[PDB]
Symmetry: C3
Subunit: 142 residues, 3 copies
């Protein structure tokens, strides 16, 4: 019942690409919201913000079309993880990455096209998705 059992710590989001065109050196703005109940992901910037310190899982899946895709998962101010998928004609591809990262309050995580942004073949339409998900797995205790 209300307030009855162990308290549940939640911080999670799952978002998809719509019409946004990637911009060099900027976070990828995923604006389709599968889940963002804590408002910890900001679709106006593409960044997730940690409000509960702990261990987080992040996972992304990209439909690769027209151009190569190369993305970087950033934490705070640093690229942590890289995923490259080359595109050849008539061969849509699927690229993914996932990792665990420990985060402190205020740390931000986001996805960006790698380098100066050329390998930006991320794709979505009414029946194709490119997604980015993150969630708190273990809150810190002390």
């Amino acid at each position: 019942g209300p307030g009855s059992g162990a308290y549940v710590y939640r911080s999670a989001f799952s978002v998809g690409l719509e019409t946004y065109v990637t911009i060099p050196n900027m976070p990828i703005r995923f604006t389709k919201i599968f889940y963002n109940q804590q408002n910890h992901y900001d679709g106006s910037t593409g960044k997730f913000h940690c409000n509960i310190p702990g261990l987080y899982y992040f996972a992304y899946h990209i439909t690769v079309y027209m151009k190569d895709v190369k993305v970087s998962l950033f934490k705070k101010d640093k690229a942590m993880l890289f995923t490259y998928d080359q595109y050849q004609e008539n061969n849509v591809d699927q690229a993914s990455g996932s990792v665990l990262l420990h985060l402190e309050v205020g740390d931000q995580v986001w996805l960006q096209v790698y380098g100066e942004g050329e390998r930006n073949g991320l794709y979505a339409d009414n029946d194709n998705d490119s997604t980015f998900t993150g969630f708190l797995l273990y809150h810190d205790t002390n």
Copy 2:
């Protein structure tokens, strides 16, 4: 107390039926019996936030799948196949579910992009789990 609801399953026949769930029948985990291998459908028994992740070996034909919730397509994954180039396609998402909601995968559309593949040494899998039970 631990709230558990999870399953992880694999394909053992890769022949699909248009407009029907992909029936993953190999059981990696299904301890709560919340996934029904006779239909290919997960049944929500605990309201909350769920993570779903699938991985498909793409062979012989293009693959296009849709993750369904309550007979609505929620998520799409397309991977074209070129000869002599087996591929790997995957998708994952968080969905909030209420008790009674059902989730499954289907080949997209009229079912023609059905190049999913599994055999004795190749897998295509579908996994889901409760992450946070709902509370007030």
Copy 3:
């Protein structure tokens, strides 16, 4: 407020695969419990329960086929052919219930020839696992 934690997330660096041997991922994204052993490439269950495993491989120069092993048996197979001038991305994930003593790791399939895994300063191939639900009595 106690949380049962057992998790790791690791990436390939300069290690070169060898037939019939675990793949030794040495870039540590997380390994706070030391339940993954970088000296051998193996995760060891230290808390009986349900675990999620997920891996992502950059496929370059040669076909990739990997097997996820649990207690010396291959559980799960992921194959991705490499065509010239077409780097690919291969992934797999599964839930496995583990008991004390169970080890989990990745190997190249079969005799080890489909070993096109790739990593460098701006490409990754990763392996992650975590305890989702500890067993209770």
